[PDB]
Amino acid sequence: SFSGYLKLTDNVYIKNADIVEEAKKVKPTVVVNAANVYLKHGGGVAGALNKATNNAMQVESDDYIATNGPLKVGGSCVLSGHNLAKHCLHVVGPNVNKGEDIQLLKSAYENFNQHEVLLAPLLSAGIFGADPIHSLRVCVDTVRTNVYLAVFDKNLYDKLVSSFL
């Protein structure tokens, strides 16, 4: 199972890890992708997860979008986890860099409550432009299921743990 996580709350855990390497090691039931509404997995966590699937995640995602249209910001869809997990929960957090409402970050985290345990990144952090300290606070105040957070950046991981209220 999951190893080396620091416990933040009853249900939230955190580790300085590359979520791709973590997914290949654990092969969890659910890995969360930091998706955009188009499921275009170009960069950040999405680009890295998609590259690990040899682009199979992108091919599956394009078929999903062709059938269903784009997701909503704050929304999600469940697709295959390919070689990384049983399922991938593609969750769209607001992209502050695109002028999206930061208040949608709580709606984005609510999607995690439909899964008993998840391996996940901090939503809207990184190239999505939100403050990761704010993202972690929304995570612990919104998610009630067991969430194992992988924070790639060591310096950000240290700042998140040392500032956690």
Side-chain angles (χ1 to χ4, degrees), residues 74-164:
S76 73
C77 72
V78 177
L79 290 173
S80 179
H82 301 276
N83 57 316
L84 299 178
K86 171 154 191 186
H87 296 296
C88 177
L89 178 70
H90 295 272
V91 181
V92 185
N95 186 323
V96 167
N97 291 326
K98 301 178 187 165
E100 297 166 356
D101 187 4
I102 194 58
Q103 313 199 358
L104 290 164
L105 184 55
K106 188 174 182 74
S107 302
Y109 272 115
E110 288 169 344
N111 293 286
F112 287 27
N113 291 323
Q114 302 294 320
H115 300 280
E116 279 188 337
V117 57
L118 316 89
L119 166 60
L122 282 171
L123 298 180
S124 297
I127 70 175
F128 281 62
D131 177 4
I133 293 178
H134 175 59
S135 185
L136 179 54
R137 178 42 53 194
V138 176
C139 180
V140 310
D141 291 348
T142 308
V143 183
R144 297 175 304 280
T145 56
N146 295 324
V147 58
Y148 287 82
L149 297 165
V151 175
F152 180 63
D153 198 273
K154 182 253 192 198
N155 291 322
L156 173 60
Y157 173 80
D158 292 343
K159 180 173 170 49
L160 286 165
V161 172
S162 75
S163 64
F164 181 67

Side-chain angles (χ1 to χ4, degrees), residues 36-55:
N36 53 52
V37 299
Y38 305 110
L39 304 183
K40 287 307 189 192
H41 312 304
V45 170
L49 291 174
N50 179 57
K51 178 180 181 201
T53 73
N54 188 39
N55 209 53

